[PDB]
Amino acid sequence: VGYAVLGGAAGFAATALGALMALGLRAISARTQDAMLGFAAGMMLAASAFSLILPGLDAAGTIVGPGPAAAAVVALGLGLGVLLMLGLDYVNRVWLFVLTIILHNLPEGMAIGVSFATGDLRIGLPLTSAIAIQDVPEGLAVALALRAVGLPIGRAVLVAVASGLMEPLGALVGVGISSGFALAYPISMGLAAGAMIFVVSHEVTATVGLMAGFALMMFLDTAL
C-alpha cells in the first residue's frame, strides 16, 4: 500500500510539474499537443502490454499453472476492464471535459496500485515511472486544453493539478481489488490493462509521439 501510495504520489507530482509548465506556455501549436498525446498514448499502450498483461500471465501461470487457464484469467480480467470503462462512458461544458480527464486517470491510478500489490518492484517501478513520465506532458496538455476552452491559465493549472489527485486515489482502489485472493492479482492486472487500452483506443506527428512512447517503454521494461 505504502509503495503504491508513493507510486500514485509520484504520479500526482508529475502531473503537477506538467500543469505548472503551462503557466509559461499558455498556448501551443495543435501539432505539438498532438505530438504529446501520441507520446502519452504510446507509453500507455506499451506499459499495459509489457508491464501488465505479460507480467499478469506469469503471475497467473504460477498460481494456476502454465496451462491456458492462466491466460484465460488475465484475458477475462482484461475484457472486464473494457466493459468497466465502456460502462463508465456516461458553458456548463467545462465540467464534462474534466470528468473525461478524471475518467482517463482512473485506470492509470489502479495500474500503479495493482503493479505493487505483491511488492515486486520489478513490476511496480517500470510501470510507475512509465506512468509518471507521461503525466508531465498530459498535465501540460490538460491545463492547455482547459485554457483553450475558456479558463484563465491559473484556474486551468489548478484544475489540472487537482486532476492528478485521481492517481493516489486510484492506486488505493488498485491495491484493494488485487489483494482479496490470489487470483485477484492477475485478474486485476488484466483489468487495468483492459481499462487503459480502452481510454487510449477511445480517447484518440502523433505516431512519431506514439512510437517514441512505445520505444521508450520498451527501453524502461528492459532496464527496470
Short mmCIF file of all heavy atoms in Angstrom, two decimals, residues 153-192:
data_model
loop_
_atom_site.label_atom_id
_atom_site.label_comp_id
_atom_site.label_asym_id
_atom_site.label_seq_id
_atom_site.Cartn_x
_atom_site.Cartn_y
_atom_site.Cartn_z
N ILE A 153 -5.49 30.91 -17.19
CA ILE A 153 -4.48 29.87 -17.07
C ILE A 153 -4.34 29.43 -15.62
O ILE A 153 -4.03 28.27 -15.34
CB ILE A 153 -3.14 30.34 -17.68
CG1 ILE A 153 -2.15 29.17 -17.79
CG2 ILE A 153 -2.56 31.54 -16.94
CD1 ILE A 153 -2.58 28.09 -18.79
N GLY A 154 -4.62 30.33 -14.67
CA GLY A 154 -4.45 29.98 -13.27
C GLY A 154 -5.44 28.92 -12.83
O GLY A 154 -5.07 27.94 -12.17
N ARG A 155 -6.71 29.09 -13.19
CA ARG A 155 -7.71 28.06 -12.93
C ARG A 155 -7.36 26.77 -13.64
O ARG A 155 -7.54 25.68 -13.08
CB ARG A 155 -9.09 28.51 -13.40
CG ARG A 155 -9.79 29.49 -12.50
CD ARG A 155 -10.93 30.12 -13.27
NE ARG A 155 -12.12 30.40 -12.47
CZ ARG A 155 -12.13 31.19 -11.39
NH1 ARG A 155 -11.02 31.75 -10.94
NH2 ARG A 155 -13.27 31.39 -10.76
N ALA A 156 -6.88 26.88 -14.88
CA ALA A 156 -6.61 25.70 -15.69
C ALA A 156 -5.55 24.84 -15.03
O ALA A 156 -5.70 23.62 -14.90
CB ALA A 156 -6.19 26.13 -17.10
N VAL A 157 -4.46 25.47 -14.61
CA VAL A 157 -3.44 24.75 -13.86
C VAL A 157 -4.06 24.13 -12.62
O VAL A 157 -3.99 22.92 -12.41
CB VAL A 157 -2.27 25.70 -13.54
CG1 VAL A 157 -1.24 25.04 -12.60
CG2 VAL A 157 -1.61 26.15 -14.83
N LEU A 158 -4.74 24.96 -11.83
CA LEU A 158 -5.40 24.49 -10.61
C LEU A 158 -6.20 23.22 -10.85
O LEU A 158 -6.01 22.20 -10.16
CB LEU A 158 -6.28 25.61 -10.05
CG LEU A 158 -6.83 25.43 -8.63
CD1 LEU A 158 -5.72 25.44 -7.56
CD2 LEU A 158 -7.89 26.51 -8.33
N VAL A 159 -7.08 23.23 -11.85
CA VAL A 159 -7.89 22.05 -12.14
C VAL A 159 -7.01 20.89 -12.61
O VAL A 159 -7.20 19.74 -12.18
CB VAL A 159 -8.98 22.38 -13.17
CG1 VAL A 159 -9.67 21.12 -13.65
CG2 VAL A 159 -10.00 23.32 -12.57
N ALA A 160 -6.05 21.18 -13.48
CA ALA A 160 -5.15 20.12 -13.93
C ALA A 160 -4.40 19.51 -12.75
O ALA A 160 -4.32 18.29 -12.62
CB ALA A 160 -4.18 20.67 -14.97
N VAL A 161 -3.85 20.36 -11.87
CA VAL A 161 -3.19 19.86 -10.67
C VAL A 161 -4.15 18.97 -9.87
O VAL A 161 -3.83 17.82 -9.57
CB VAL A 161 -2.63 21.03 -9.83
CG1 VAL A 161 -1.99 20.54 -8.53
CG2 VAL A 161 -1.57 21.76 -10.60
N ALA A 162 -5.35 19.48 -9.56
CA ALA A 162 -6.34 18.65 -8.86
C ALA A 162 -6.62 17.34 -9.59
O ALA A 162 -6.91 16.33 -8.95
CB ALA A 162 -7.65 19.42 -8.67
N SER A 163 -6.58 17.33 -10.92
CA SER A 163 -6.91 16.12 -11.67
C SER A 163 -5.95 14.98 -11.35
O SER A 163 -6.34 13.81 -11.36
CB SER A 163 -6.86 16.39 -13.17
OG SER A 163 -7.69 17.50 -13.50
N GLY A 164 -4.68 15.30 -11.08
CA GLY A 164 -3.73 14.27 -10.73
C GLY A 164 -4.02 13.60 -9.41
O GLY A 164 -3.49 12.51 -9.17
N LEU A 165 -4.84 14.22 -8.56
CA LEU A 165 -5.27 13.58 -7.31
C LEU A 165 -5.95 12.24 -7.54
O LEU A 165 -5.97 11.43 -6.62
CB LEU A 165 -6.21 14.50 -6.52
CG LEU A 165 -5.48 15.66 -5.83
CD1 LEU A 165 -6.47 16.73 -5.34
CD2 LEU A 165 -4.65 15.12 -4.68
N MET A 166 -6.50 11.99 -8.73
CA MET A 166 -7.05 10.67 -9.12
C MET A 166 -6.00 9.55 -9.14
O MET A 166 -6.34 8.37 -9.14
CB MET A 166 -7.70 10.73 -10.51
CG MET A 166 -9.23 10.50 -10.60
SD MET A 166 -10.13 9.12 -9.46
CE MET A 166 -9.07 7.63 -9.92
N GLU A 167 -4.72 9.89 -9.17
CA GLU A 167 -3.76 8.80 -9.20
C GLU A 167 -3.49 8.24 -7.81
O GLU A 167 -3.44 7.01 -7.65
CB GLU A 167 -2.50 9.26 -9.91
CG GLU A 167 -2.94 9.99 -11.15
CD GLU A 167 -2.24 9.54 -12.39
OE1 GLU A 167 -1.01 9.38 -12.38
OE2 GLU A 167 -2.96 9.23 -13.34
N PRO A 168 -3.35 9.06 -6.77
CA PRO A 168 -3.30 8.46 -5.42
C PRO A 168 -4.57 7.71 -5.07
O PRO A 168 -4.51 6.60 -4.53
CB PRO A 168 -3.08 9.67 -4.50
CG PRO A 168 -2.50 10.72 -5.38
CD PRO A 168 -3.08 10.51 -6.73
N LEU A 169 -5.73 8.29 -5.38
CA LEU A 169 -7.00 7.61 -5.11
C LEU A 169 -7.07 6.26 -5.83
O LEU A 169 -7.33 5.22 -5.20
CB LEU A 169 -8.16 8.50 -5.53
CG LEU A 169 -9.54 8.03 -5.07
CD1 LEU A 169 -9.59 7.95 -3.53
CD2 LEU A 169 -10.63 8.95 -5.63
N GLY A 170 -6.82 6.27 -7.14
CA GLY A 170 -6.91 5.06 -7.94
C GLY A 170 -5.88 4.02 -7.59
O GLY A 170 -6.09 2.83 -7.87
N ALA A 171 -4.77 4.43 -6.99
CA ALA A 171 -3.79 3.44 -6.54
C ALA A 171 -4.34 2.66 -5.36
O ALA A 171 -4.16 1.44 -5.28
CB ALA A 171 -2.48 4.13 -6.17
N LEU A 172 -5.02 3.35 -4.43
CA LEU A 172 -5.73 2.65 -3.37
C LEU A 172 -6.71 1.65 -3.95
O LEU A 172 -6.67 0.46 -3.61
CB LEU A 172 -6.46 3.64 -2.46
CG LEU A 172 -5.71 3.97 -1.16
CD1 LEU A 172 -4.25 4.16 -1.46
CD2 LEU A 172 -6.28 5.22 -0.51
N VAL A 173 -7.59 2.10 -4.86
CA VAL A 173 -8.54 1.18 -5.49
C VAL A 173 -7.82 -0.05 -6.05
O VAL A 173 -8.29 -1.18 -5.88
CB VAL A 173 -9.34 1.89 -6.59
CG1 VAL A 173 -10.12 0.86 -7.44
CG2 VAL A 173 -10.29 2.91 -5.98
N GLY A 174 -6.67 0.16 -6.68
CA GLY A 174 -5.97 -0.95 -7.30
C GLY A 174 -5.39 -1.94 -6.30
O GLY A 174 -5.41 -3.14 -6.54
N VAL A 175 -4.86 -1.45 -5.17
CA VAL A 175 -4.34 -2.38 -4.17
C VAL A 175 -5.48 -3.16 -3.53
O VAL A 175 -5.29 -4.31 -3.12
CB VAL A 175 -3.48 -1.68 -3.09
CG1 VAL A 175 -2.18 -1.25 -3.65
CG2 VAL A 175 -4.18 -0.50 -2.49
N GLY A 176 -6.66 -2.56 -3.44
CA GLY A 176 -7.82 -3.20 -2.86
C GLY A 176 -8.29 -4.41 -3.64
O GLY A 176 -8.32 -5.53 -3.11
N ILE A 177 -8.65 -4.20 -4.91
CA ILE A 177 -9.19 -5.27 -5.74
C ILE A 177 -8.14 -6.28 -6.17
O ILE A 177 -8.48 -7.26 -6.85
CB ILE A 177 -9.86 -4.66 -6.98
CG1 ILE A 177 -8.79 -4.17 -7.96
CG2 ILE A 177 -10.78 -3.53 -6.55
CD1 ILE A 177 -9.33 -3.38 -9.12
N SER A 178 -6.87 -6.09 -5.82
CA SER A 178 -5.85 -7.06 -6.16
C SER A 178 -5.37 -7.88 -4.97
O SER A 178 -4.52 -8.76 -5.15
CB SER A 178 -4.66 -6.35 -6.82
OG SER A 178 -4.16 -5.34 -5.97
N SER A 179 -5.91 -7.66 -3.78
CA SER A 179 -5.39 -8.31 -2.59
C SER A 179 -6.36 -9.27 -1.91
O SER A 179 -5.95 -10.00 -1.00
CB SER A 179 -4.94 -7.25 -1.57
OG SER A 179 -6.03 -6.41 -1.23
N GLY A 180 -7.63 -9.33 -2.33
CA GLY A 180 -8.61 -10.13 -1.61
C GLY A 180 -8.42 -11.64 -1.72
O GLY A 180 -8.97 -12.38 -0.90
N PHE A 181 -7.69 -12.11 -2.73
CA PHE A 181 -7.48 -13.53 -3.02
C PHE A 181 -6.42 -13.62 -4.11
O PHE A 181 -6.09 -12.63 -4.76
CB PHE A 181 -8.79 -14.25 -3.41
CG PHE A 181 -9.63 -13.54 -4.47
CD1 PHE A 181 -9.83 -14.12 -5.72
CD2 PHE A 181 -10.27 -12.33 -4.20
CE1 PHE A 181 -10.61 -13.48 -6.69
CE2 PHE A 181 -11.04 -11.69 -5.18
CZ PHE A 181 -11.21 -12.27 -6.42
N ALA A 182 -5.86 -14.82 -4.29
CA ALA A 182 -4.63 -14.91 -5.08
C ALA A 182 -4.89 -14.70 -6.57
O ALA A 182 -4.03 -14.17 -7.28
CB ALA A 182 -3.92 -16.24 -4.84
N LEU A 183 -6.06 -15.11 -7.08
CA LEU A 183 -6.41 -14.83 -8.47
C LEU A 183 -6.67 -13.35 -8.71
O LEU A 183 -6.55 -12.89 -9.86
CB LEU A 183 -7.63 -15.66 -8.89
CG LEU A 183 -7.35 -17.07 -9.42
CD1 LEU A 183 -8.65 -17.73 -9.84
CD2 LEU A 183 -6.36 -17.05 -10.58
N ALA A 184 -7.02 -12.58 -7.68
CA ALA A 184 -7.31 -11.16 -7.87
C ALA A 184 -6.14 -10.44 -8.55
O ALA A 184 -6.36 -9.55 -9.38
CB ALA A 184 -7.65 -10.50 -6.53
N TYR A 185 -4.91 -10.82 -8.22
CA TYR A 185 -3.75 -10.14 -8.80
C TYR A 185 -3.75 -10.23 -10.32
O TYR A 185 -4.01 -9.21 -10.98
CB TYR A 185 -2.46 -10.70 -8.19
CG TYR A 185 -1.19 -10.08 -8.69
CD1 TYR A 185 -1.05 -8.70 -8.75
CD2 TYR A 185 -0.11 -10.86 -9.06
CE1 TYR A 185 0.12 -8.11 -9.17
CE2 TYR A 185 1.08 -10.29 -9.49
CZ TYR A 185 1.19 -8.91 -9.55
OH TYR A 185 2.35 -8.32 -9.97
N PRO A 186 -3.53 -11.41 -10.94
CA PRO A 186 -3.54 -11.45 -12.42
C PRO A 186 -4.84 -10.95 -13.04
O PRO A 186 -4.79 -10.39 -14.14
CB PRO A 186 -3.31 -12.93 -12.73
CG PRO A 186 -3.88 -13.64 -11.56
CD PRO A 186 -3.46 -12.78 -10.39
N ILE A 187 -6.00 -11.14 -12.38
CA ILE A 187 -7.24 -10.56 -12.89
C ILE A 187 -7.12 -9.04 -12.91
O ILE A 187 -7.35 -8.39 -13.93
CB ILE A 187 -8.46 -11.01 -12.06
CG1 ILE A 187 -8.69 -12.52 -12.13
CG2 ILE A 187 -9.74 -10.34 -12.55
CD1 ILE A 187 -9.57 -13.04 -10.96
N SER A 188 -6.76 -8.46 -11.76
CA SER A 188 -6.61 -7.01 -11.67
C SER A 188 -5.61 -6.48 -12.70
O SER A 188 -5.80 -5.38 -13.25
CB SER A 188 -6.16 -6.62 -10.26
OG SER A 188 -7.17 -6.93 -9.33
N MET A 189 -4.58 -7.25 -12.98
CA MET A 189 -3.58 -6.87 -13.95
C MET A 189 -4.20 -6.77 -15.29
O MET A 189 -3.94 -5.77 -15.94
CB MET A 189 -2.47 -7.86 -14.01
CG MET A 189 -1.71 -7.86 -12.71
SD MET A 189 -0.50 -6.35 -12.72
CE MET A 189 1.03 -7.53 -12.93
N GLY A 190 -4.95 -7.77 -15.74
CA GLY A 190 -5.70 -7.71 -16.98
C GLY A 190 -6.72 -6.59 -16.98
O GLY A 190 -6.92 -5.91 -17.99
N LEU A 191 -7.37 -6.36 -15.84
CA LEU A 191 -8.40 -5.33 -15.76
C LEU A 191 -7.82 -3.95 -16.03
O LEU A 191 -8.39 -3.18 -16.82
CB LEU A 191 -9.06 -5.39 -14.39
CG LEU A 191 -10.47 -4.83 -14.25
CD1 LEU A 191 -11.08 -5.40 -12.99
CD2 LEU A 191 -10.44 -3.32 -14.19
N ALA A 192 -6.70 -3.61 -15.38
CA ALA A 192 -6.10 -2.28 -15.57
C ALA A 192 -5.58 -2.11 -16.99
O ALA A 192 -5.77 -1.05 -17.60
CB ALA A 192 -4.99 -2.03 -14.56
#
